[PDB]
Design a protein around this ligand. Structure first.
Ligand SMILES: CC(C)(COP(=O)(O)OP(=O)(O)OC[C@H]1O[C@@H](n2cnc3c(N)ncnc32)[C@H](O)[C@@H]1OP(=O)(O)O)[C@@H](O)C(=O)NCCC(=O)NCCS
Ligand SMILES: C[C@@](O)(CCO)CC(=O)[O-]
Ligand SMILES: C[C@@](O)(CCO)CC(=O)[O-]
Lengths: 375, 376
């Protein structure tokens, strides 16, 4: 597959669609889903949320030049803002010359929180739970036998305590669950809620909230990119000068939350559109991203930018990225299914890796422009 | 306008649409935009973003029973997740019995950052800028006569310094701009560019970036709600017990970032759909919300929940809310325009106030369920 779409930005929507169908070998029916308005039937729409009275459209585009771990990939994006798709495509083009984007990710692990509250001895109760963790882990898994046969399931449990709160001492158990190709919400909420009774028996307290945590710091995705000075040379500045300017911009975001917020927003300009295109939950992705950005106590930059021993500009992006290939709109929306088809992803983590590659490219594009704009 | 919409739940989409058109007196052309697929022409879509090859649909719904400062309002929402719209509508229903939602907001003030490097004297340069602030403020305003005549314009300037960074000392100036019924991006970025030269002359340093800040903490919107124990009573728990459970949930979110993130996510489940429906930038709203949530040095809850002297559950939501009635997709998308018509908002801040009322209702709905019989 060749993701380099020469003059793509100049072709009409119909010609672009036609092209894409050729390169990927899409069927007639497939192409029809995009060539005609209304791919989301009302009976499906009406079943997705409540009080439905119609549908709302947003442009559906494809970013070009992406390469992940040596393989070309086409990226669908749904958003209303200008310059996003173009910036992503351009930066991806420059990345190709140096190997493209290199990515990796952890197992798809999600947290399931179980809050406990009228315990006179929360600290002691915590060791009682840890003592019987295997028992708890087995109860959570037999709950769902199919997931375990697919390679997932509850892998462990952690317990934290907050003995000093205005409502008193609280004990919070975390089930660590491998959710496979799903986002994780229902799977995880379901186990938390099967284990609640046993935890009450062990601790003697009262279980309150049983719910997942959107701060998915155990489900990380990572991307790297490299750019040389020769590729950033403008008619006004040398490539070396531009790189120095980009490093200044990064340092600025690392120390000032007012810039970091804007800096990180640019990253989500690239990621959210891919989430929407695949029918995934963008509020979940946004919460995990920004909460992770301030885990140290200071709200900073999700990406990093440096200059290697060769003077080359190198950036990274590591962040929580919970997404699914199954569940909700990802399965019921005809276009969400087509997007996955166009992407060619076989696992949820593969989609997560593409997401951060796009976020990284978007961040780079924004800084390059901000740093090259004449006064 | 009566926003209760009886039986809306069981109506068909066509019947719901018809009913809405009646209440608001919408024209046939307007109803046609929703009764038919393709309200967004491809010539418009193709001009919105790059490399377009078609369009992507999401359900368009209307939340019922909302009431803002004594006036009923219908709320459009575009999202893919179930139970959002129903929860919002149900909580709005309970709020009506006690006066509905009460809201307020600050002026539409946005920050425009101007970063300066290349000077060994940042802390002196900062006073040089403050000394000539009126001059700077006048230069920024002459750049937008219309905005000022409409009641907006640069109102002041702030200057901050970061004398010690891995890249050397930095000076950062903030233009404080009233942008009225606009989100603010282009308006503020333009004034920043216009003032950059003068700032360089005054400080002797080199200007780098000139860009707005998405941490819009000077453009806040606020909402309040009140619920009585009688309204929260279930077959299993007493009203008073439920309220105590909700307070436990709030305390949990206030101390543990793992819960706060999820807690705040629920708030955005209510807000983002309204942003999409009005053609606004949802990444901007999300960034301002979460960054604001950790301004104290600890990522916490955007909302607050308490019990007043009467034992009634009272909640609040104050947060940055950048939105516009003009600019971008808000003007070019036929349905974004219809949404504003349905809402009846006359200013951007009025839309911002409705947004937080919805976010507050959503948060309440999620906690009531979690604390009571379950989320599931
Ligand atoms: C949706 C929910 C209310 C349904 O169960 P319920 O409490 O048994 O429902 P009720 O029949 O008592 O609901 C009554 C009111 O809720 C609203 N409601 C409930 N189900 C609804 C639906 N399918 N469509 C529209 N409104 C609905 C109605 O507006 C109604 O008022 P009305 O007189 O104007 O018609 C409940 O599951 C809930 O609140 N869940 C919380 C989950 C959450 O926070 N979800 C967010 C997405 S995570
Ligand atoms: C330009 C930018 O604001 C993107 C626009 O939404 C991001 C950034 O400043 O890095
Ligand atoms: C139910 C909730 O998880 C929303 C799901 O999308 C929010 C919350 O926990 O408050």
């Amino acid at each position: 597959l060749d993701s380099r779409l020469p003059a793509f930005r100049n072709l009409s929507p119909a010609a672009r669609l036609d092209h894409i169908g050729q390169l990927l070998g899409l069927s007639h029916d497939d192409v029809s889903l995009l060539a005609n308005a209304g791919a989301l039937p009302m009976d499906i729409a009406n079943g997705m949320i409540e009080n439905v009275i119609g549908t709302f459209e947003l442009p559906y585009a494809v970013a070009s030049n992406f390469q992940i771990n040596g393989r070309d990939v086409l990226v669908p994006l749904v958003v209303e803002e200008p310059s996003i798709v173009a910036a992503a495509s351009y930066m991806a083009k420059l990345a190709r010359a140096n190997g493209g984007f290199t990515t990796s990710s952890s197992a798809p692990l999600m947290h399931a929180q179980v809050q406990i509250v009228g315990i006179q001895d929360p600290l002691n109760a915590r060791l009682s739970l840890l003592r019987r963790k295997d028992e708890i882990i087995e109860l959570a898994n037999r709950k769902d036998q199919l997931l375990n046969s697919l390679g997932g399931g509850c892998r462990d449990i952690e317990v934290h305590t907050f003995a000093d709160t205005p409502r008193g001492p609280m004990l919070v158990a975390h089930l660590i669950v491998d959710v496979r190709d799903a986002m994780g919400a229902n799977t995880v909420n379901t186990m938390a809620e099967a284990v609640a009774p046993l935890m009450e028996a062990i601790t003697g307290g009262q279980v309150r909230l049983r719910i997942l945590s959107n701060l998915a710091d155990l489900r990380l995705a990572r991307a790297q990119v490299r750019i040389t000075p020769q590729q950033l040379e403008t008619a006004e500045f040398s490539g070396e000068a531009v790189i120095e300017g980009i490093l200044d911009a990064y340092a600025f975001a690392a120390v000032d939350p007012y810039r970091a917020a804007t800096h990180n927003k640019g990253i989500m300009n690239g990621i959210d559109p891919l989430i929407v295109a695949t029918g995934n939950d963008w509020r979940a992705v946004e919460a995990g991203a920004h909460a992770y950005a301030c885990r140290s106590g200071h709200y900073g930059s999700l990406t990093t930018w440096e200059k290697d021993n060769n003077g080359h500009l190198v950036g990274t992006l590591e962040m929580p990225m919970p997404v699914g290939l199954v569940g909700g709109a990802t399965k019921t929306h005809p276009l969400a299914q087509l997007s996955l088809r166009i992407l060619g992803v076989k696992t949820a983590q593969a989609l997560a890796e593409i997401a951060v590659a796009v976020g990284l490219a978007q961040n780079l594009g924004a800084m390059r422009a901000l740093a090259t704009e004449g006064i």
